[PDB]
Amino acid sequence: HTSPDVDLGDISGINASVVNIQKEIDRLNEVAKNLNESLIDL
Amino acid sequence: HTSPDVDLGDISGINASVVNIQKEIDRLNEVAKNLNESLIDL
Amino acid sequence: HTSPDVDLGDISGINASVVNIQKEIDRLNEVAKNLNESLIDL
Amino acid sequence: ENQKLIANQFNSAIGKIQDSLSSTASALGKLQDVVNHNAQALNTLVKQLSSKFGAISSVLNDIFSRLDKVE
Amino acid sequence: ENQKLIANQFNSAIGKIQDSLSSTASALGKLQDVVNHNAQALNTLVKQLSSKFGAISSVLNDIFSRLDKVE
Amino acid sequence: ENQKLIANQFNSAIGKIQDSLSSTASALGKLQDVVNHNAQALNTLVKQLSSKFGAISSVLNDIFSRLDKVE
């Protein structure tokens, strides 16, 4: 008798990363706005 | 006696988004094809 | 009596893809380095 | 002669930027495909998970009922 | 006259590359948003999964205990 | 003098597009890394999930067997 406490264990050892490329996106938008200063006006 | 109906409950409140950037990809390909009209022919 | 072996079944039929765009990233970095040969030196 | 140099450098730059835009389009296409596939994967995972958890709950409720009938 | 041609072609190319950079920024923003949302989704999935699996384990341990008390 | 203006504007534009391509490469690299890591995460999640669900099923089959032996 006395059945042991069969513990299923905790699901673990896993996790999802998190992208943080907002610096890069902001830099692209800044460059797209800045290229207006590179237009040629003869 | 009369053990209650222990309901585990439904896994919910979660969901995965869906990217739809095909407009942007098509615009990039259109621009890559259109830059041929920007080549300089002296 | 003789309760049947109720098998839960295996979770399956699913799988996550794997991106392999390292060729494209390397091509972008190569172009960003190559545009230095496109600078104009009058 | 300087105009021919400017024109040649500009055409080379536009060709290189054309290649870069094609590469960016291909990369965004592959990321779109894979993120969408993994989204569908997680969604169907939670669907089949809900089903399996409900089935487990049912067979439990069953064995409590039957063990209560034992007592 | 050739300078006006060079200038016009250059301005057209810069406008097109401006559009391409805006499109790339928008696409990377949408991918960032969705990948982050799916990351949070998988994380909370495993959290609620750990909770549910623990609850299942508990009610099991319970029914072994009670069935042992039956015998 | 107009040629020097054209050359200066072109070099500035190429420098800015160089920065933009470096930024796009970095962003695609980070998205690739994270999407791949989350893909491996979901895959190992379903693997360990299959294992845990099978173990649950086994211990069930066990307790039906033992409760049948009770009756």
Residue numbers in the entry:
A (entry chain D), B (entry chain F), C (entry chain E): 1159 to 1200
D (entry chain C), E (entry chain A), F (entry chain B): 918 to 988
Give passages from the manuscript.
Previously, we reported an unmodified peptide with an extended sequence composed of 42 amino acids of the HR2 region, termed longHR2_42, that was designed to target these relatively more conserved HR1HR2 regions; this efficacious peptide inhibits infections by the original Wuhan strain and several variants of SARS-CoV-2 with an IC50 of ~1 nM. However, the inhibition activity of this peptide against the Omicron variant was around fourfold weaker in the vesicular stomatitis virus (VSV)-SARS-CoV-2 chimera infection assay and around tenfold weaker in the authentic SARS-CoV-2 infection assay. We hypothesized that this decreased inhibition activity is probably caused by the three mutations in the HR1 region—Q954H, N969K, and L981F—of Omicron BA. New mutations emerged both at antigenic interfaces under heavy selection pressure, such as the RBD, and at more distant but functionally critical sites, such as the S protein fusion core comprised of the HR1 and HR2 regions. These mutations within the fusion core of Omicron lead to major conformational changes of HR2 in the structure of the HR1HR2 postfusion bundle and a decreased activity of a potent HR2-based inhibitor against infection. The N969K mutant structure revealed a similar HR2 backbone displacement as observed in the Omicron HR1HR2 structure with all three mutations —the average Cα atom rmsd for residues 1,162 to 1,170 is 0.7 Å between the N969K structure and the Omicron structure, 2.3 Å between the N969K structure and the Wuhan structure, and 2.4 Å between the Omicron variant structure and the Wuhan strain structure. The comparison with the Omicron and Wuhan postfusion bundle structures illustrates structural rearrangement of HR2 to accommodate the long lysine sidechain at position 969. However, the L981F mutation is probably not required for tolerating the destabilization of the postfusion S by the N969K mutation, since several Omicron subvariants do not have the L981F mutation.
